[PDB]
Symmetry: C2
């Protein structure tokens, strides 16, 4: 499965709940619609796309408006202005000891460059990634 | 580079979700994942007995669990000890994947330079590397500047 999405969803559900907006089916469609697309939305266009694709949601423009606002304040979305898209914050990678749970955070520039080469080579624009290494530390063996 | 640092262990999260009961069933799976050893049903019992007496997992629950966590695939049983079969979590090698977040197109890959770098990173920090996960996310050449397809 797409791990990036599950992390985005968890984080979305958390922002809603913390901000005291309900987590509903309408909001989940809304997050999916922003994740799976490559274009920027106004509240008006995001509402139309959702209304058009899932008519039985009875999505209203106010939920869309208020969610976008909550997401912007949480830095989950960026705004070009109106016009929004999910933020892609750069991040590091992790190595996890299977025994004691010690974690090493790292970023290896040679690996980062190869990932961009793999993407270029198959015509992908590279947008995100996840890397974890699992092992046993020196102390645990 | 290395950095001072809440992170989820994805291969574990997945293992647990595949396993899907009780607090006893959980401690067993956790014991197998967190140990750098091959257990017999007996050694596994004694280990949970040393560490979680209060939960009293019977030897029957141990055999039953291992059997069930076997006629699935989740554990491998190759080799013997005096006390019985030795068991290991299945740890198959795998390739890496790039996924288009629009059309779901999946490209499988394995780049030897990255795999050797991962070996170096483990070595530099004194770790023995036993597994890894690498997913790349992006927009394939067919999904540029488009909505959910
Ligand atoms: Cl007790
Ligand atoms: Zn990375
Ligand atoms: Zn350790
Ligand atoms: Zn790999
Ligand atoms: Zn695509």
């Amino acid at each position: 499965e797409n791990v990036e999405y599950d992390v985005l969803l968890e984080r979305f559900k958390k922002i809603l709940r913390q901000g005291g907006l309900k987590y509903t089916k309408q909001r989940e469609v809304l997050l999916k619609t922003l994740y799976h697309s490559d274009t920027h939305y106004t509240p008006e266009s995001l509402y139309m796309e959702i209304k058009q694709a899932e008519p039985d949601l009875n999505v209203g423009i106010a939920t869309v408006y208020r969610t976008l606002n909550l997401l912007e304040e949480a830095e989950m979305v960026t705004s070009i202005s109106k016009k929004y898209e999910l933020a892609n914050k750069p991040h590091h990678d992790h190595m996890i000891c299977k025994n004691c749970g010690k974690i090493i955070e790292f970023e290896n520039p040679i690996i980062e460059r190869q990932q961009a080469l793999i993407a270029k080579e198959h015509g992908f624009k590279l947008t995100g990634h996840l890397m974890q290494l699992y092992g046993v530390c020196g102390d645990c063996n």
